Amino acid sequence: KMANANKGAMTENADENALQSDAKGKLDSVATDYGAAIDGFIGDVSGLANGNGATGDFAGSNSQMAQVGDGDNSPLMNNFRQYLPSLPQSVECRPFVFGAGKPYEFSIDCDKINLFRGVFAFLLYVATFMYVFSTFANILRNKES
Amino acid sequence: KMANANKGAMTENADENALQSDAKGKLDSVATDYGAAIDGFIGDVSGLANGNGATGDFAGSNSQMAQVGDGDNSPLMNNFRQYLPSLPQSVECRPFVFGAGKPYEFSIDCDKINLFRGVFAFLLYVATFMYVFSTFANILRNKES
Amino acid sequence: KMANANKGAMTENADENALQSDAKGKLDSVATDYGAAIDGFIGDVSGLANGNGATGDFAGSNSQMAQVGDGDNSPLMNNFRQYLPSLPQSVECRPFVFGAGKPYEFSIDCDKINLFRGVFAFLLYVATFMYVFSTFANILRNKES
Amino acid sequence: KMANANKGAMTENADENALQSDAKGKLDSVATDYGAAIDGFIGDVSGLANGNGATGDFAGSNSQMAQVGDGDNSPLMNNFRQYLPSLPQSVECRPFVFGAGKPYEFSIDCDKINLFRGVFAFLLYVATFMYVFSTFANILRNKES
Amino acid sequence: KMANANKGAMTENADENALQSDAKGKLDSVATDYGAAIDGFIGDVSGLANGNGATGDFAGSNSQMAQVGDGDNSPLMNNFRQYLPSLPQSVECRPFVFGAGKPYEFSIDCDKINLFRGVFAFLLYVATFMYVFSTFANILRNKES
Amino acid sequence: DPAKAAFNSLQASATEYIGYAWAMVVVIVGATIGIKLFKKFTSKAS
Amino acid sequence: DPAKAAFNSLQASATEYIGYAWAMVVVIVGATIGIKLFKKFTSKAS
Amino acid sequence: AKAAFNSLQASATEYIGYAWAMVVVIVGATIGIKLFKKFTSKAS
Amino acid sequence: DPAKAAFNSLQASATEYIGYAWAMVVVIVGATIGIKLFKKFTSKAS
Amino acid sequence: DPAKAAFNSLQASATEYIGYAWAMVVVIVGATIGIKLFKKFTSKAS
Amino acid sequence: AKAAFNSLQASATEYIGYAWAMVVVIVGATIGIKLFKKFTSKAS
Amino acid sequence: DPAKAAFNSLQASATEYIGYAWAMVVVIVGATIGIKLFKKFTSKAS
Amino acid sequence: DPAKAAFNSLQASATEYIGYAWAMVVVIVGATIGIKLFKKFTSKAS
Amino acid sequence: AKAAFNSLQASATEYIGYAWAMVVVIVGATIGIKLFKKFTSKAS
Amino acid sequence: DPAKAAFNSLQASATEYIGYAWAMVVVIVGATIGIKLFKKFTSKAS
Amino acid sequence: DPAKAAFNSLQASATEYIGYAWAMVVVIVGATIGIKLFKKFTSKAS
Amino acid sequence: AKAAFNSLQASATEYIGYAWAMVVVIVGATIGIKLFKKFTSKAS
Amino acid sequence: DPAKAAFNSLQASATEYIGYAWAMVVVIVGATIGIKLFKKFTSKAS
Amino acid sequence: DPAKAAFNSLQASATEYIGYAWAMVVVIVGATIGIKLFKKFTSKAS
Amino acid sequence: AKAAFNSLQASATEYIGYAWAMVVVIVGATIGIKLFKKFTSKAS
Amino acid sequence: PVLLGIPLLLRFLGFLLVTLFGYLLTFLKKGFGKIAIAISLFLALIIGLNSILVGYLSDISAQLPSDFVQGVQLILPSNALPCFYVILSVKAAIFIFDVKQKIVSYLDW
Amino acid sequence: PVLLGIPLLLRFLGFLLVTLFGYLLTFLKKGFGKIAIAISLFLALIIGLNSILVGYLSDISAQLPSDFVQGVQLILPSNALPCFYVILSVKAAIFIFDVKQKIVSYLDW
Amino acid sequence: PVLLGIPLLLRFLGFLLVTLFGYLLTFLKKGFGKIAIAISLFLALIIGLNSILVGYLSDISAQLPSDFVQGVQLILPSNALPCFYVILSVKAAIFIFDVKQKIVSYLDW
Amino acid sequence: PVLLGIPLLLRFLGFLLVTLFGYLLTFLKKGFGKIAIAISLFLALIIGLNSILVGYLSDISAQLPSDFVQGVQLILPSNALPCFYVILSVKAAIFIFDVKQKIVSYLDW
Amino acid sequence: PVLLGIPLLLRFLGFLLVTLFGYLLTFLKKGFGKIAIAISLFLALIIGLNSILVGYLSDISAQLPSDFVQGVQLILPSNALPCFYVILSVKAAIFIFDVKQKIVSYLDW
């Protein structure tokens, strides 16, 4: 059988289950690194956004995001509080006396000042409430709030 | 015929209709998963947008989108209604009497108060109508409305 | 010539001009569908934009775009016209008579009312012209107009 | 040497420097068209932007961009100039005479009118200068200017 | 052994470690250029942004970015300073004398002018502080600041 | 004594004059207040 | 008594004046409202 | 004597009647002008 | 009795004076109202 | 003395007038505040 | 003589009493009208 | 000399009149200032 | 009668004053309108 | 007697004529100044 | 008759007084109008 | 002379009134400034 | 004769002294009320 | 002639009265102008 | 005649008053303009 | 007789001269105060 | 004149390329459908907002009383209502221009 | 009728294509998960901001005094509170419209 | 010195690569045409809006009466009309700057 | 049971695929580094702007005089300073919300 | 120990990969050049707009008269001009911050 001799001369025993397994193993061992990198980027950006934190390339922005602050306490904003103008603290009403000790001595009875103080407080609330309501209603709109 | 023997020694019977069918079957069985994933993402985002609902990864945003609300009833906005300032309810006009029982007793006839109330109602409408018209006209513009 | 016999045993006559032609024919017959789909999408979106119309997936938005309107006649905007507040129509000036028939009978001569009406018309124009000019000048800016 | 005969029977003389050269020549002859198309698109858009001009697909927008104008002379804007309201041209001050020829004849000395005209000119400048300064400072902000 | 002769006739000694090494060497020698180009673009844009500088294609924008300026000293903005309106420099208060030398000679005591100057300075601060605070609070919002 | 009766008569006349004047001034002040309030309310409304 | 007749005549004259004044003030108020509405439209537009 | 006093009293009352008939007209005109000016000013 | 005729003559003179005064005051008040309304309308218009 | 009694009566009348004036001014102030609040809402909205 | 002076003094004081009783009413009415107008104007 | 005593009595009467007038004017001016300040504060507040 | 002649002369003088006042008020109104228009432009621009 | 009364009546009317001719000028000047001030104030 | 000449002299004196008063009032009113117009124009300008 | 003493007393009284008026006007001015500042904040916020 | 004139002159000056002492008080009160009203109005 | 000396004395008294009145009015007008300017400046400032 | 001299003196005094008033009103107008300019800057900024 | 009338006429004119010399000062002071107040009010 | 299996290999390569490019075509059509869905949702949201806004105006409707008509007609010039209608027309034109520009911008998806 | 190794080569090519396309599918699912995470974060930020804003209004609360009620009721027309509520409803509708439009725009990721 | 079919296989591979890259070139040209169409539509919309806006101003035109000219000329300084024209020129410059910046931004498509 | 060279060809194909996919991984990491650099630059710019703005307020500082305190205390209600502080807190909350939303939007790079 | 043509086929495959990846590199460099051109055009447009705006201010220039200086100096506090200059400096800082942020955003092209 010369056919058998020629076939044996130009033939190498190759197994599909070996070559396929090796190729798939290498491809998986590198695709796992690919997926790990993608998931790491996603986790870093999410942690920066929600305050959990970031590791790796984004670790340097942790200090900056902590300086920005969360909730309503912004350390970047609190710098302006040191220069905030000083304003008087509201106290009880004291009547003002004109010409004290003289025959023309009259004083503001301060009974109507309290009524004015009540209506002023009401107006200040209605203004602040409307401001906050419009502030929340126009968050997606690129407007000052 | 040594030619025939050598040809038979180094030949394997392979059918195109088998290899092509197998490859196409595997490729289709995975491309259907690809298309199903794409369509599932599209359906989830559309359901979140129009209020139908989402399943899978976006199922967690169903609660948030239900809290946002649809139409004009926003449960996120209705929180402010509890703190809404109280305002008097409009009633019929009552004349005001100055110095009741005295020789200088005069009262506001309240006949012109009704005319003023009518013109005030007209002005309040023209303001609200213009506000709503401009609100709808400037929806795509990033402006408060 | 055993060489010739062995060569004939393991040789099949294949023509480049046939395999190349078949492959190119199939690839072109599918790439024409690709290009047709791209051009159809482009035409549909352009027709929706400029009012020519769309066919296929975008055919459902034809009704919505017709409801939006073109030029300045918006059927979506014309809904507000039904609730438009009624305002008096401008007519010629009629003098107002005080105390008609009495010894103290004086009337507004309405000669200066026409001069005021002219200057008022001029002011209303200069306001509307400036509004329209600024409206057109700030179309790309995301501002109310 | 049967080995030599069999080797000669199933061997064709192929040169690497020919097949490689042919493939690279075809690929370069089509990649040059690719690069030429990319550069043509870039040049067309740049010419439309800076007023140099465009050729090819973008040639149709040359008329539109010329109608828009460059510098500050916009033919689209100059259409409004025809309807611009007419305003008086500033001239020298003429005193106004009350009761000319009568014993109660007094006239505005127009000495203080010139001082008022100077301060009015100053105020108009400070307003226009501030407007232009804020206009340039808020070009990237989507605000009216 | 004719099998050995036929095997030797149609066999060339090829080493995997040579072909693999050559292919990987060429691919790496071009991928290093790819990565260098990407990193060069990144560095150029970052240097333009933070004022470090750019080299290559972006080198032409170095002059423009230097003209824009950094910090708060903008050479583009300093052009307006030459045309800035001239305003008086604040000095100490000088009383104004009416009818000097006449029996009706009275002068503004300028004691209350200083109190008004203090309260005016306070109001100007509270306005400027609020303006700066809102300016910083609305930097991401597309609003004038 | 006629003087006492005369003084009483003048006092009664003055009282009736005061009554008429009070009526007229009440009417006038009421009209003035009504007009003023109407003008103020309309001015504030628009 | 002539005094009461004169006072009643004065009161009637005052009432007529009040009616005419009410009519004229209503007209002038309408004019003011019209001016403000038709200027506010354009002003708020811009 | 008594007749003279009676005649003087009658003539006095006749003149008072005329003085009142004059002063009513004068005062009415004055008050009319005053109220006219006041109300035309208030209405405008 | 000349006094009655004299009183009637003075009354007629007072009546004609009242007529002239009414004419003049009507003219003056009309002009004042016109000027005031013109100024108010122009001030509100701009 | 009649003078002091008259002065006290005048003072009491003034006090009554002051009380009534305070009530009426409070009412009118409330009306003004209501007008401004319900116009400010719509005006600020637009 | 002395009795006449005493009677005149008494009658004078009686008339002063009546004059005061009249002027208090007149002045009260005038001041009332003035204050009424002033306060109704101030309150509105 | 009765004239000196009469002058002193008139001076005392004038002084008591001045006292009563001062009391009344203080009351009136206090009320006026209170009303004016209330109106001004409310007008500025809204 | 001199009285009617004097009254007519006064009326004519008043008419002349009214005409001159109308001219001057028109001029001043034009000035006010010009000031407001040329300040409003720049103010609304910014 | 009668001639004296006639002369007195004539002289009286002559003086009335002069008094009227004076008062017309005085009143005209006063009213002119008043109206001038009023209208120059109203127009401005 | 000295009375006629005296009346003429008083009339001439009154006429010259009227002339002087007219000159002074023209000066005063001109200054007042100038100041008022300056203040109004400046207030409207800013 | 009594006249100069009375004039000096009047001047001293005027000076006292001026001092008290200055104090009261300072207080009222402070109140007005406070009202405007605390309303301007909220108003400008919205 | 001369003594009567001297007494009348003295009595006249005594009364002038009293009239001045009264008018100073009256005028002071009037001016005080006027200035009080004016300044309380100006300050508010 | 005592009349001439009396006239001179009254003229001197009038002159000193004028001096005192000038001093007092200067003080009053200065205070009024100061208060008015303070109120105006503060009102414009806020 | 003393009358014309007095009238000329009064006119000269009025002219001096007018000049001083013009100077003072110019100063006060400058102050008002300065206040409005330096408040408008900050106000328009925000 | 005639000399008495001449003396009375002369004395009358002398007094008129003094009355004018007084009234000019008084009126000048009054008008000065009035104009001062008016112009200081108008300028501010 | 080639060994066996070469034509079969070439046919297999062509078949693989055709199948892959057909998959690409299917995914492209899916993307176009996604774009159409997005445009439809955007326009539907606009229409719904319009419907809600138009409904609110029925309740609060009010009219100018019979009075005040005389004064308004006394002062009203000939070009007041035309100016108001021009403003409304400008508002509508800008609205539809914005909508069409958004539709144009949907070409980048 | 082909040489040995051709079917094995074709099977290897098919296996390589299947593995690569499966990797592509996995990466696509990762991207979809990223989009879902982004949407969740955006909505959570909105909800947190709302919570903070609602809390501030408790402290500064104030009420109109008993006085001034008479005048307000004296003047108040029948359509004042309806207008105020219409304005508030318009504010809420615009807010939810903006939120839904942003959700729609998330289709381009 | 190679077996038969290797050169034919290499030629087939080159032909496949050339055909695929030509398809890519055609699709790139299609995309460029799409960008050009988008730019044309955007500019056409702007021009149409301008045409509509210019037309409205003809009807409502009005002029200042003959009066009020004297006062305006009495007060008008030398730099009022120049300031108004400077404002208009600034408006036009900003408009064309925005248009050109949008054209530049179209480079990212 | 295959000819020589088939296993070597398959190994070469696998090696080529591995090398190309490793290059893709390296480029992906480069892109992630670019995104991190961009975020860092953006936050640094914000911080620098804040530093400059805080510095300006030192020079122009001024205080309310001792006077005017009595009137302000006379009128000031109990909820004025709380309202002012609520406004400031709202400003700060909106600022940090905008910053966090921009950080979230950086997920699309 | 392999048949003839296998090494030549492998060399051809490597050559094809190298040529394709070089084409990709060339296209990447073209894209970077496009980005640089866009940035240059944007900055040039800003500079040109600045040049035009600075030129207009020469004509309309005016100065405060000699009068009104006394009153302004009478009232002017010590911190008015510093406040005005602080406002101008804030305007300039915000402008350059916006420009730099746009330059940063050009990293996404």
Author numbering:
A (entry chain R), B (entry chain T), C (entry chain K), D (entry chain F), E (entry chain A): 262 to 406
F (entry chain W), G (entry chain V), I (entry chain M), J (entry chain P), L (entry chain Q), M (entry chain L), ...: 5 to 50
H (entry chain N), K (entry chain X), N (entry chain I), Q (entry chain S), T (entry chain D): 7 to 50
U (entry chain Y), V (entry chain Z), W (entry chain O), X (entry chain E), Y (entry chain J): 2 to 110
Authors' text:
Filamentous bacteriophages package their circular, single stranded DNA genome with the major coat protein pVIII and the minor coat proteins pIII, pVII, pVI, and pIX. Here, we report the cryo-EM structure of a ~500 Å long bacteriophage M13 mini variant. The distal ends of the mini phage are sealed by two cap-like complexes composed of the minor coat proteins. We further performed local refinements of the mini phage by dividing the particle into the top, middle and bottom three segments.
Our reconstruction of the bottom cap reveals a pencil-tip-like structure, where five pIIIs and five pVIs form a sharp cap enwrapping the pVIII cylinder. The N-terminal short helices of pIIIs assemble into a helix barrel, maintained by hydrophobic interactions and hydrogen bonds. In this structure, the helixLNs from pIIIs are located at the outer positions while the helixLNs of pVIs occupy the inner positions. In the sharp-tip like helix barrel, the outer surface of pVI is predominantly hydrophobic but contains two positively charged rings that are formed by R12, K30, and K31 in the helixLN. However, the helixLN of pIII is rich in negatively charged residues, which are in close proximity to the positively charged regions of pVI and shield the hydrophobic surface of pVI. However, in comparison to the interactions with pVIII at the same location, the interactions with pIII are more extensive, indicating that pIII may be able to effectively compete with pVIII for binding the pocket.
